[PDB]
Amino acid sequence: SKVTTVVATPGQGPDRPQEVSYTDTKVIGNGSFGVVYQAKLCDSGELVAIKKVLQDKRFKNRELQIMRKLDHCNIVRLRYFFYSSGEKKDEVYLNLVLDYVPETVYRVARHYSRAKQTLPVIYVKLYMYQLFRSLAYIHSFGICHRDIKPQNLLLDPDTAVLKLCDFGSAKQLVRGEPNVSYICSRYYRAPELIFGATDYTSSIDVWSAGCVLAELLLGQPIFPGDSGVDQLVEIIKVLGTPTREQIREMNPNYTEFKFPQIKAHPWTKVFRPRTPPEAIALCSRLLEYTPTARLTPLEACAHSFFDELRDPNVKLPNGRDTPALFNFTTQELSSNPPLATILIPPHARI
């Protein structure tokens, strides 16, 4: 193989297009947008990913907009973007150049699942905390990810750092304008979306995080619907039939045309016996029907499930130190600054 060179504007920086060179291209992903590659930067030999998408020449690309304005150690950094042409003869692709992170939460969880083992709760806390922190960041901008799932959580296995990726469904939600309801992967889809809501909040993402938490504890999806509609049934088999007032606050226009009566299944019986009670309790406040009842990502960060992460004696199981869990910015804390007293423990205050 050889060297490819392009002119790429830097991601969040100035609109100063520069020459970037890279080699060692290999496919690592795809979808409706196009293809994703791994590449090695010829300058630093740093691994990056390149998401290549077909851009309609005349409209703007909302993923690029969302990504140019994000800077967070639990999100994949847009290093550069650039344009290219080919395969479509006379048509243009937008190329996102992003941090490459080598593992995913789906693959870790799959690997313990195939071994009839459970991911140890220390990795559950580390992964879930970093997820919530990144949700607090994007939600402070009113950007909803709309695709929280284990496949979109990247991991460095040596540093235990997590990064959110795939902003292909991210939208900046304005109050007023509607949003499509058939969003998120089925398994992680919040119940108001299944009722066809169109003016939902960013709490759909928090729902999805609870699905991820619950899955990490169970070793399998908690709500495995076989269709977009039977998803709701799988939910009801755990949370019970939603009260009409709960259906009122998912979407007020009653597209509620289905289910029967099923008592809630006790939260303690749905998980395995040696499950931490703080885990269940955090789960129980994420997957609530009423969208305004779910914890915000910042409050879930403050949850007592993550007290071990606030201890001063905490090191990863491989002996190294935890990533930086407290370097909070004013933007992260904007939804509830007084949380800082819990989120930034004393042994880490300047």
Ligand SMILES: Nc1ncc(-c2ccc(S(=O)(=O)N3CCOCC3)cc2)nc1C(=O)Nc1cccnc1
């Ligand atoms: N920034 C990234 N950094 C790493 C990965 C990534 C990491 C590991 C794997 S992998 O474990 O399946 N294995 C690894 C090695 O070779 C075979 C595959 C696959 C992808 N993706 C992305 C990314 O942005 N993805 C994306 C974005 C938008 C839409 N759709 C996908």
